[PDB]
Amino acid sequence: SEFMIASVRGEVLEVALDHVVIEAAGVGYRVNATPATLATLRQGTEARLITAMIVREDSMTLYGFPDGETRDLFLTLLSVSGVGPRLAMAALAVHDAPALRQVLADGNVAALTRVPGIGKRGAERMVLELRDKVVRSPVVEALVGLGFAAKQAEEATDTVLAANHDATTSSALRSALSLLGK
């Protein structure tokens, strides 16, 4: 969820079948990508991918995608116990984000099992863990994320919105926070 490299943009130096090399500031970044994302990319031209940076004791890796929503879905898959980055990429290479989303949403285990490395029991854990996972609400969420409880988060938010109808998401949040700081 929190990493450092959120995207890479610059000249495509190489399109392979499971990754691309994008040169930013003379540095050529290898970012792994599905064949679908890769097909939109042309060597010699400038591109931008939205990335998830993965840091392990013995590796550092970029996984890239067309948009933040797809990148966030990738991270979401990684939140399932037993689902690592390769598998998550595998899954998205077989089912594009929309299709992967609906499969999970509809609990389509047969679809899921079509992915190498996802057995039936694995498919089910995924569906179970992810089924539900695929102004006012965003704000409540931010508060919750900061540690606040749904109850109190909602109340500060409703009060803030009530007093100020022009409120944007950020202002609402800063007003709510200010009240919660009590």
d(CA 62, CA 41): 16
Q: Which parts of 76-95 interact with a copy of itself (CB under 8 A)?
A: 81-82, 87, 89-90, 93-95
Binding a copy of itself (rule: CB under 8 A), the pick from 67, 98, 99, 119 is 99
Q: Which parts of 120-179 interact with a copy of itself (CB under 8 A)?
A: 124-125, 128-129, 138-139, 142, 145-149, 169-171, 173-174, 177
d(CA 77, CA 34): 15
75 lines the binding site for a copy of itself (CB under 8 A): no
In the structure encoding, which two tokens stand for residue 97, read together? 């984000």
Contacts of 131 (CB under 8 A, 6+ apart): 104, 105, 107
* Least distance between a copy of itself and beta carbon 62 (Å): 6
Nearer Cβ to a copy of itself (45/59): 59
* Least distance between a copy of itself and beta carbon 50 (Å): 8
Contact 97, 88 (CB under 8 A): no
- Reported as type and span, the H/E element at residue 28 is strand 27-32
55 lines the binding site for a copy of itself (CB under 8 A): yes
